[PDB]
């Protein structure tokens, strides 16, 4: 009479999802590579069963999956992910917050044959963003209007009062990919044409993006948004971009890091020994001395700055990280990874601080009668203060939608089998309704000249 769920926990997002599931009368068994991790992550909630589990272990996982009705994976989905394949073998349902990839799509037919539902892209982004993007588009098309440009930007940042560090950004994991994904390429629709931008300019396109007077945001496009002309069914749109929001100064600092060779993951002989940052930076930057003046002069000769005041701030930001000091580096074989070890240590959310999620869609509309209007769909939320025991906005907006999904797959509200994403009113309406009415999670629409 009671459905149980296997949750492949992953940091923050775990608590919220667990709380929603356990409160709906669902048995949840929180799995983490460490038992203590799962216990401290499942304390305070009824019907919770923590256990140790290695997901990288086929038999171990495959065996646990059969013990429950559905598998939730909050772990960033990789090409090497047994999770879904295992659910197919066990004829068990799945819910992930990951993007549907071609690799994942190949498993569609076998998932259907197995009669299981694999619901993905239902966190914050992808997730809540799809729901509201499609909602507006359907409303517009129904009124005979046209979506001329579709823009969508989302940022998981620290609240402004907690953004005081060089990147105006706080980390909770491997900045490994956070930084890596900063020099990637991007494709999107502009002026009705598939425009592309190579990494060597991505941060150069990261320009100020106005939303509210109080915030200082910048925006850059995602990997590729072109697929959305079809996925969101907007053939008439000349501009289509799904991107990311960061605070002012983020791009410029990252760009300087790139320009001086700090984002290179190219293994270095000297970066696998606890040497002084001072010496490591000298080598990475290729200066002639480990002197701060020599390092700075070298950095200035290989970087670009918009102003002297900013150059001073960026250089000050680097010094603050300690890369000009004698403090030993924590070895990681390459520049990128060695720097991340320090970034992660110097830029974590500290007790009492708050994160912030800012999501906003922008639609340039051409009405039936020929009128033009710009509509926005926004979601701005602060997380509970670190240490207060609440949820960070990020953990809430990813974990709740995901938990709702699980519930809808368990009670049949979502019955389409196979590999899904929230791309049609049949799946989306139930999701938006429950998120708005029961949890207050929603995007607010507004019109502009």
Q: By the criterion CB under 8 A, which residues form the site for a second copy?
A: 157-165, 167-168, 210, 212-216, 247-250, 309, 312-313, 315-316, 319-320, 356, 374, 380, 382, 446, 448-449
| Closer residue to a second copy (CB): 165 or 413 | 165
| Closer residue to a second copy (CB): 142 or 449 | 449
Main-chain dihedrals φ then ψ at residue 340, nearest 5 degrees:
-60, -35
Least separation in angstroms between residue 290's CB and a second copy is: 18
DSSP character for 259? H
| Closer residue to a second copy (CB): 185 or 380 | 380
Contact yes or no for 149/133 (Cβ under 8 A): no
User: Torsion over CA of 168, 174, 178 and 184, rounded to 10 degrees?
Assistant: 150
Least separation in angstroms between residue 156's CB and a second copy is: 13
Q: Among 9, 15, 32, which residue's Cα sits nearest to residue 391?
A: 15
Q: How far is CA 390 from CA 12, 58, 220, 381, 386, in A?
A: 11, 35, 30, 13, 8
Active-site residue 125, yes or no?
yes
CA 85 distance to own-chain centroid: 24
| Closer residue to a second copy (CB): 274 or 449 | 449
Least separation in angstroms between residue 378's CB and a second copy is: 9
Contact yes or no for 407/5 (Cβ under 8 A): no
Phi-psi sector, 233: left (phi>0), alpha (psi -120 to 50), beta: left
Count the Cβ atoms, other than its own, within 10 Å of residue 94. 25
Check 19, 125, 129, 337 and give the catalytic one. 125
Q: Which two tokens stand for residue 350?
A: 């500290």
Least separation in angstroms between residue 6's CB and a second copy is: 37
Rounded Cα gap, residues 228 and 345, in angstroms = 37
Q: Which two tokens stand for residue 158?
A: 């620290």
Rounded Cα gap, residues 130 and 424, in angstroms = 9
Q: Among 314, 431, 407, 422, which residue's Cα sits nearest to residue 27?
A: 407
Least separation in angstroms between residue 213's CB and a second copy is: 3
| Closer residue to a second copy (CB): 211 or 409 | 211
Least separation in angstroms between residue 448's CB and a second copy is: 5
CA atoms within 13 A on the CB side of 146: 12
| Closer residue to a second copy (CB): 27 or 190 | 190
The residues carrying an active-site annotation are 125
């Amino acid at each position: 009479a009671t459905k149980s769920v296997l949750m492949l926990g992953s940091g923050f997002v775990t608590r919220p999802t667990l709380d929603v599931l356990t409160d709906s009368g669902i048995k949840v068994t929180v799995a983490c590579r460490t038992l203590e991790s799962a216990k401290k992550l499942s304390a305070g909630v009824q019907h919770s069963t923590p256990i140790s589990l290695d997901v990288n272990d086929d038999a171990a996982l495959d065996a646990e999956v059969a013990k429950h009705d559905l598998v939730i994976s909050l772990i960033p989905y990789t090409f090497h992910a047994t999770v879904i394949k295992s659910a197919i073998r066990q004829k068990k349902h799945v819910v992930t917050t990951s993007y549907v990839s071609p690799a994942m799509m190949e498993l569609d037919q076998a998932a259907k044959d197995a009669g299981i539902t694999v619901m993905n892209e239902i966190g914050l982004d992808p997730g809540i963003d799809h729901l509201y993007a499609i909602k507006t588009i359907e409303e517009v098309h129904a009124a005979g209007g046209k979506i001329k440009t579709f823009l969508s930007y989302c940022g998981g940042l620290p609240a402004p009062e907690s953004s005081d560090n060089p990147l105006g950004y706080k980390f909770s994991w491997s900045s490994r990919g956070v930084l890596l994904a900063l020099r990637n390429a991007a494709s999107f629709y502009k002026d009705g044409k598939v425009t592309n931008v190579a990494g060597p300019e991505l941060m150069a396109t990261a320009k100020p993006y106005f939303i509210y007077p109080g915030f200082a945001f910048v925006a850059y496009p995602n990997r590729d948004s072109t697929p959305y002309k079809e996925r969101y069914q907007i053939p008439e749109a000349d501009n289509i971009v799904r991107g990311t929001l960061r605070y002012q100064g983020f791009p410029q600092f990252i760009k300087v890091l790139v320009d001086i060779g700090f984002l290179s993951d190219e293994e270095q002989p000297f970066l696998k020994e606890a040497i002084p940052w001072k010496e490591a930076t000298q080598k990475i930057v290729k200066a002639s001395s480990a002197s701060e003046q020599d390092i700075v002069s070298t950095i200035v000769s290989n970087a670009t700055f918009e102003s002297t005041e900013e150059q001073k701030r960026i250089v000050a930001g680097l010094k603050w990280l300690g890369i000009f000091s004698d403090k030993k580096i924590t070895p990681r074989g390459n520049a990128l990874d060695t720097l991340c070890a320090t970034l992660e240590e110097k830029m974590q959310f500290e007790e009492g601080e708050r994160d912030l999620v800012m999501l906003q869609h922008k639609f340039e509309i051409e009405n039936k009668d020929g009128s033009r209007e710009t509509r926005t769909s926004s979601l701005c939320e602060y997380g509970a203060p670190i240490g207060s025991g609440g949820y960070s906005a990020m953990a809430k907006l990813v974990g709740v939608p995901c938990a709702v999904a699980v519930k809808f797959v368990l009670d049949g509200t979502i019955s389409d089998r196979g590999v899904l994403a929230p791309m049609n009113s049949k799946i989306n309406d139930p999701l938006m309704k429950e998120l708005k009415e029961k949890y207050g999670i929603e995007c607010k629409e507004k019109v502009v000249a």
